[PDB]
Amino acid sequence: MLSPELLAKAFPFHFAFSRNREIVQTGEVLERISPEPLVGKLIEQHFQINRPKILIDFDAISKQPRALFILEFLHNGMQLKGQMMYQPEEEVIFFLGSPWITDTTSL
Amino acid sequence: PELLAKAFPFHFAFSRNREIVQTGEVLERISPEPLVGKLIEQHFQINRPKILIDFDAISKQPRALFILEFLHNGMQLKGQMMYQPEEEVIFFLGSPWITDTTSLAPLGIK
């Protein structure tokens, strides 16, 4: 029921990836923040998954739809937390992440 | 900053009297009634942690993930409660859990 334009705007720090681990879309704020452009790049060159303890693996990720995911943006060290929303029809996962705001979190 | 208002379109901010003083762009769009000036407990419940809706109590859980439920439709918003001592407000930087059913459409007439 969710508009793709609405989803993207609702989550300014999201990224979406395909099963080859390539990033296919990013939110407005995330893109503006990254030094390299993220679309076309592999997840593991820009992110680390801190929680749950699992592989950056499309299939492994699709098996945990209720888990709170915590990813680190390797560039600034921000801890992004959120849902990994699986779209089986599109063969895309959306990490609908947003940063924890601590005193030393720099955007 | 006031980028915070933009990067968290579902946020709301509140004061010690539990009055909502500010809301994100998307939260207002989907709300059945304007939230600014309303009391938190008329519109939301806290599911996690198992705490009172209380400015002081919330301010002492700075590292907890809060789960609030928007009472109107059962939407679960998850996020940080970020205290701002200099402004005398807490920001709930929540985001909705997204399901097949999720609508981020404005409500229409009535």
What string of H, E and C letters represents the secondary structure of chain B? CCCHHHHCCCCEEEECCCEEEEECHHHHHHCCCCCCCCEHHHCEEEEECCCCCCHHHHHCCCCCCEEEEECCCCEEEEECEEEECCCCEEEECCEECCCCCCCCCCCCCC
- Contact (CB, 8 A) for A27 and A41: no
Helices (H), A11-94: 28-33, 58-62
Give the CA diameter of chain A: 40
Residue in chain B lying closest to A32 (CA): B7
- Distance between CA atoms of B87 and A8, rounded to whole angstroms? 31
Looking at chain B from residue 45 to 74, which residues have their Cβ under 8 Å from any Cβ of chain A?
Answer: 65
Q: Which of B31, B78, B80 is nearest to A101 (CA)?
A: B80
> Within a 10 A sphere around the Cβ of B106, how many other Cβ atoms?
10
Contacts 24+ apart (CB under 8 A), B82-90: B82/A101, B83/B58, B83/B59, B88/B15, B88/B16, B89/B13, B89/B14, B89/B15, B89/B21, B89/B22, B90/B13, B90/B14, B90/B55, B90/B58, B90/B59
Q: Which region holds residue B99: left if phi is over 0, alpha if psi is between -120 and 50, else beta?
A: beta
CB contact under 8 A, B104 and A11: no
CA distance A71 to B6: 21
Contact B27, B14 (CB under 8 A): no
- The CATH fold of domain A1-107: Beta-Lactamase (3.30.450)
- Percent helix, percent strand, percent coil in chain A, to nearest 5: 20, 35, 45
CATH number at B1-110: 3.30.450.260
| Nearest-CB residue to A6 (from B3, B79, B104) | B104
- Considering only CB atoms, which chain B residues are within 8 Å of A12? 6-9
Query: Is A10 within 8 Å of chain B by CB?
Result: yes
Q: How was this structure determined?
A: X-ray
Nearby residues of A1 by Cβ (< 8 Å), 6 or more positions away: B100, B101, B102, B103
Listed by start position, the domains of chain B span 1-110
Distance CA B98, CA A14 (A): 13
How far apart are alpha carbons B60 and B58 in whole angstroms?
5
Give the type of residue at B72.
H
The closest CB to that of B102, out of A1, A13, A101, belongs to A1
Structure-token pair, residue B30: 């989907």
Quote the CA–CA distance of A104 and B34 in Å, as a whole number. 34
If we measure between CA atoms, which residue out of A102, A96, A46, A87 comes closest to residue A68? A96
Q: Are strands B20-23 and B12-15 parallel, antiparallel or unpaired?
A: antiparallel
Cβ contacts of A21 within 8 Å, gap of 6 or more:
A42, A43, A44, A56, A58
CA distance B101 to chain A (A): 6
Give Cβ neighbours of residue A104 (< 8 Å, ≥ 6 apart): none
What is the structure's resolution, reported in angstroms to one decimal?
2.0
